[PDB]
Ligand binder design. Structure first.
Ligand SMILES: NCCCN1CCc2ccccc2C1
Length: 150
């Protein structure tokens, strides 16, 4: 009963979260996950500012209203060489990664580690925050509030 949450640097408060290293988060679970980080799904404007500060990924994730990939450098296999906040238009499927926005983060690039899930609630899941440098913080808890997600 274990969940790995892979987290990135924050850029103007925005970061990327991947559950168990594969696209596996519903829109409802994404909201709950950011909430556990005392964060919200970013708005498009928040994501655009994060991009301008140096945020890019190669993964689809939820923001408020859309599923996107922020791109700085054109790469053929990441949003098909697009740059900017690339918006997913056509897909059959409902599960992706998520982005989250923490208003308390630093204004620009913050590539320090994440060492807590400050707003998770009581629960039986071993939840592990995994940073890109491999540093880990684990706690027993839960964040999912929708039955269909568990
Ligand atoms: N599915 C591709 C995953 C790529 N990510 C990139 C971001 C990241 C952050 C923390 C731990 C692992 C990882 C691996």
């Amino acid at each position: 009963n274990q969940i790995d949450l892979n987290v990135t640097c924050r850029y103007a408060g925005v970061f990327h979260v991947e559950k168990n290293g594969r696209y596996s988060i519903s829109r409802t679970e994404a909201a709950d996950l950011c909430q556990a980080f005392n964060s919200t799904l970013p708005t498009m404007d928040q994501m655009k500012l994060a991009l301008s500060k140096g945020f890019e990924t190669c993964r689809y994730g939820f923001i408020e209203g859309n599923v996107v990939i922020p791109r700085i450098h054109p790469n053929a296999i990441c949003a098909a060489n697009h740059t900017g906040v690339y918006i997913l238009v056509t897909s059959n499927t409902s599960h992706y990664d998520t982005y989250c926005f923490n208003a308390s983060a630093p204004p620009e690039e913050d590539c320090t580690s994440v060492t807590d899930l400050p707003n998770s609630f009581d629960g039986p899941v071993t939840i592990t925050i995994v940073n890109r440098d491999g540093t880990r913080y684990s706690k027993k808890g839960e964040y999912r509030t929708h039955q269909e997600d568990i």
